Amino acid sequence: SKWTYFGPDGENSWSKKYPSCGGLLQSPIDLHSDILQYDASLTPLEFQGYNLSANKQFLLTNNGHSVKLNLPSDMHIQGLQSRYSATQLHLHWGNPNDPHGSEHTVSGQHFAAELHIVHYNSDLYPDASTASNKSEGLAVLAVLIEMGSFNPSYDKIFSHLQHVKYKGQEAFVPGFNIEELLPERTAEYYRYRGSLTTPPCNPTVLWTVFRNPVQISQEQLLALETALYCTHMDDPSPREMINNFRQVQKFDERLVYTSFSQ
Amino acid sequence: SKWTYFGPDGENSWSKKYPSCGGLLQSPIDLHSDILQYDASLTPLEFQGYNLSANKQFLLTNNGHSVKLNLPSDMHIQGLQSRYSATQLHLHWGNPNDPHGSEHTVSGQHFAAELHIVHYNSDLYPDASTASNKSEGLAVLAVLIEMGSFNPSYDKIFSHLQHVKYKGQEAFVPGFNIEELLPERTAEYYRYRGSLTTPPCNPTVLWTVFRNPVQISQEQLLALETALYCTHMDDPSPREMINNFRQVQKFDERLVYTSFSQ
Ligand SMILES: NS(=O)(=O)c1cc(C(=O)NCCO)c(NCc2ccccc2)cc1Cl
Ligand SMILES: NS(=O)(=O)c1cc(C(=O)NCCO)c(NCc2ccccc2)cc1Cl
Ligand SMILES: [Zn+2]
Ligand SMILES: [Zn+2]
């Protein structure tokens, strides 16, 4: 992975090395009325094993493209047609002079950032790597993040950023209740078939984007936007980890189904 | 002309065969208040030789990507440092289920369609082809189009669409005053340096996007979206010419200059 979000190896070039990035069913997308349709079969998901013990600890890693927290496979979503077990969460964001780095947009507007909690079909596959090539192998929960009030739950992650500033660095984060990262009224969401938003852009993701955003503060966004580097600690051409979101994609005839009718 | 706006040869793959599509200064972009800056240097352009002889005919083609009208080199913009002479106009649009296919956006919003009147620097270069990959080579006037009242002047072009239904087909349009296609208060515009929005995406275009949109009727917009195919007539797999706009590109640490402040 030397793909980036900026310059010659940025997103308009990813398809040169990752053919699925130029394929169908790409994410993210702009959620707007013309392509929305209510589906009453979109019943509420249940979040099981999301309340991670505070006496356990979970690995936080800078992977050169985002900051990721590994999650245990006992954490799962109930309500899809298979069990989906968590593998990791991570974020996408903008930069200090333009804090508008969500991946999905709503009626053309970016949010400040976006959280993805990646799960894989553990009823069918031994791990997320294997699932990532298969029909609906992954399911991602996406939370839109807007600049607002300080959020103590997101700070359980952000308080460790200065320990994972460079590519390959790892830290441990005590467990906390991951459901605290989700917004109000999780029963209201958008659902569509899409892809990884990063290389290798496999069109194998069932996306759930919650309708309501959460808030984190300006100071928490500024920490997220200034603490991290895409490059290793000893790299003589450092690159700040900023603006790590993909532009929205054409719809390719897809609709987005909504669990809310208004 | 192998490139398309859908499937494997769509916009994320243009950079394989057109490397500038993954380079700097790419268009189109979202025009939004954060990145706007009034520049009193931006005085009104003058449109000279736009009242085309009604005794002359201008070639309308379907080139498999848009509908284009050839323009004569006595038509030019005055007001820029060099004289920019017209070569052609063409349009970009969406489709009837999502009729929001402008290239530029304003505060994240697409307009229904967009007209580009392409000019080249004839003081420095002998033709548009030669100018297209050269410094200061091109200048485009962009008009945003929304749905509203019937527009007789756009119908001077739209009435001919049925004769250029398929790729390779051509029709003759009697001269008319191309300035009738411009919006109100053409003194009010956005200006920035960018690129062709189609392959080869050379970063050689000085963009002028007028502030105010024009209106065409619902029937005219439906005709533009439904009249044309990308494919030759005898193609056993026809492809409708719809959604022929490029997604907005990242545009960071840059300004769009405006001729208006209020
Ligand atoms: N943004 S996203 O669409 O939510 C997404 C991102 C990653 C990811 O780790 N990208 C690497 C850069 O941060 C991912 N990785 C899980 C995975 C993918 C392939 C192989 C192994 C693990 C799965 C997904 Cl769905
Ligand atoms: N969308 S746009 O950015 O306004 C633009 C489009 C074309 C164009 O013809 N694209 C082909 C698909 O229709 C162009 N052609 C210029 C050109 C290139 C080579 C030879 C002659 C003319 C110049 C520009 Cl600025
Ligand atoms: Zn992600
Ligand atoms: Zn154009």
DSSP assignment of B33-79 equals GGGEEE-TT-PPPEEES-B--TTSEEEEEE-SSSEEEE--TT-EEES
Nearest C-alpha in A relative to B99: A34
Nearest C-alpha in B relative to A25: B7
Between the alpha carbon of residue B31 and those of residues A95, A162, B37, the distances in Å are 18, 35, 11
Please name the residue that has the structure tokens 């009147």: B117
For residue B134, the tally of other CB atoms under 10 A from its CB is 14
Contact A16 B14 (CB under 8 A): no
> Which residue's C-alpha comes closest to atom 10 of ligand 1?
A198
CA B243/CA A251 separation, integer angstroms? 10
Q: Which amino acid is at A83?
A: R
Q: Could you report how far apart the first and last alpha carbons of chain B are, in Å?
A: 42
CA B141/CA B210 separation, integer angstroms? 8
Question: Is residue A65 flagged as an active site residue?
Answer: yes
CA B185/CA B100 separation, integer angstroms? 23
Q: Specify the fold of A1-262.
A: Carbonic Anhydrase II (3.10.200)
Among all bound ligands, the one having the nearest atom to the CA of A199 is 1
Summarize chain A as % helix, strand, coil (round to 5): 15, 30, 55
For residue B139, the tally of other CB atoms under 10 A from its CB is 26
CA B113/CA A168 separation, integer angstroms? 46
> Which residue's C-alpha comes closest to atom 5 of ligand 1?
A196
For residue B189, the tally of other CB atoms under 10 A from its CB is 22
Which of ligand 2's atoms lies nearest the C-alpha of B195?
A: 3
Residue B116 annotated as part of some ligand binding site = yes
CA B211/CA B213 separation, integer angstroms? 7
CA B245/CA B114 separation, integer angstroms? 9
Burial class of residue A55 in the structure, from the number of CB atoms within 10 Å of its CB (0-12 exposed, 13-18 middle, 19+ buried)? exposed
For residue B126, the tally of other CB atoms under 10 A from its CB is 10
DSSP B247: P
Number of residues assigned to chain A: 262
Helix (H, G, I), strand (E, B) or coil at A22: helix
Please name the residue that has the structure tokens 């936007």: A225
Q: Which residues surround ligand 3, an ion (CB under 5 A)?
A: A 116
**Where is chain A discontinuous (C–N over 2.5 Å), named by the preceding residue?**
none
Neighbouring residues of A39: CB distance < 8 A, sequence distance ≥ 6: A191, A257, A258, A259
Neighbouring residues of B126: CB distance < 8 A, sequence distance ≥ 6: none
CA A179/CA A159 separation, integer angstroms? 18
Tell me how the structure was determined. X-ray
Q: Confirm if A214 and A143 have CB atoms less than 8 A apart.
A: yes
Distance B164 CA to ligand 2 centre (A): 18
How do the domains of chain A map onto residue ranges? 1-262
Nearest to B196 by CA among B97, B113, B129, B106: B129
CA B19/CA A184 separation, integer angstroms? 45
Nearest to A164 by CA among A237, A227, A234, A88: A227
CA B119/CA B130 separation, integer angstroms? 12
Cβ contacts of A11 on chain B, cutoff 8 Å:
12
CB-ligand 2 contact for B161 (6 Å cutoff): no
Between the alpha carbon of residue B44 and those of residues A57, A213, B137, B191, the distances in Å are 64, 43, 20, 12
Neighbouring residues of B204: CB distance < 8 A, sequence distance ≥ 6: B131, B132, B133, B134, B135, B136, B137, B138, B195, B196
CB-side neighbour CA atoms (13 Å) of B211:
16
Contact A16 B15 (CB under 8 A): yes
Task: Give exposure, A14-49, as e/b (b: 16+ Cβ within 10 Å).
Answer: bbbebebbbbbbbbbbbbbeebbeeeeebeebebbb
Nearest to B182 by CA among B68, B57, B50: B50
CB-side neighbour CA atoms (13 Å) of A129:
0
Paired tokens of B160: 């001919």
Between the alpha carbon of residue A178 and those of residues A49, A116, A171, A181, B21, the distances in Å are 9, 12, 17, 6, 40
Nearest to A29 by CA among A181, A253, A262, A215: A253
Please name the residue that has the structure tokens 């380079």: B23
Burial class of residue A135 in the structure, from the number of CB atoms within 10 Å of its CB (0-12 exposed, 13-18 middle, 19+ buried)? exposed
Helix (H, G, I), strand (E, B) or coil at A223: helix
Paired tokens of A89: 């969460």
Between the alpha carbon of residue B243 and those of residues A1, B1, B94, B101, B139, the distances in Å are 32, 16, 4, 6, 24
CA B56/CA A87 separation, integer angstroms? 68
Mutate to test the pocket of ligand 2, among B4, B65, B85, B90 (most ligand atoms within 8 A of CB): B90
Q: Which residues of A are part of a known binding site?
A: 90, 92, 116, 197-198
CA B36/CA A243 separation, integer angstroms? 20
Residue B104 annotated as part of some ligand binding site = no
Task: Give exposure, B193-230, as e/b (b: 16+ Cβ within 10 Å).
Answer: bbbbbbbbbbbbbbbbbbbebbbbbeebbebbbebbbb
Contact B250 A247 (CB under 8 A): yes
CA A118/CA A90 separation, integer angstroms? 8
Helix (H, G, I), strand (E, B) or coil at A109: strand
Closest chain B C-alpha to A166 CA, distance in angstroms? 23
CA B183/CA B214 separation, integer angstroms? 5
Distance B182 CA to ligand 3 centre (A): 42
Helix (H, G, I), strand (E, B) or coil at A122: coil
Residue A203: is the preceding peptide bond cis (ω within 30°)?
Answer: no
CB-ligand 2 contact for B230 (6 Å cutoff): no
Number of residues assigned to chain B: 262
Neighbouring residues of B243: CB distance < 8 A, sequence distance ≥ 6: A250, B5, B6, B93, B94, B95, B98, B101
Paired tokens of A185: 């009224």
Nearest to B246 by CA among B56, B80, B3, B48: B3
Paired tokens of A65: 């493209």
Pocket of ligand 1 (CB under 6 A): A 63, 65-66, 90, 116, 118, 128-129, 132, 138, 140, 196-198, 205
Q: Could you report how far apart the first and last alpha carbons of chain A are, in Å?
A: 42
Nearest to A114 by CA among A103, A128, A130: A103
Q: Confirm if B74 and B49 have CB atoms less than 8 A apart.
A: yes
**Where is chain B discontinuous (C–N over 2.5 Å), named by the preceding residue?**
none
Nearest to A178 by CA among A21, A52, A11: A52
Between the alpha carbon of residue A260 and those of residues A92, A185, A194, A256, the distances in Å are 26, 10, 20, 12
For residue A261, the tally of other CB atoms under 10 A from its CB is 10
Q: Which residues of A are part of a known binding site for Zn(2+)?
A: 90, 92, 116
Closest chain A C-alpha to B102 CA, distance in angstroms? 13
CA A187/CA B195 separation, integer angstroms? 43
Nearest to B248 by CA among A249, A21, A23, A22: A249
Residues of B with CB under 8 A from a CB of A: 5-8, 10-16, 21-23, 26, 34, 97-100, 105, 107-110, 243, 247-250, 252-253
Nearest C-alpha in A relative to B15: A13
Size of interface A-B (CB pairs under 8 A): 70
Torsion of CA A67, A72, A77, A81, to 10 degrees: 110
Q: Confirm if A203 and A140 have CB atoms less than 8 A apart.
A: no
Catalytic residues of B: 65
Paired tokens of B203: 């970063």
Q: Which amino acid is at B166?
A: Y
Nearest to A30 by CA among B108, B8, B186: B108
CA A257/CA B8 separation, integer angstroms? 25
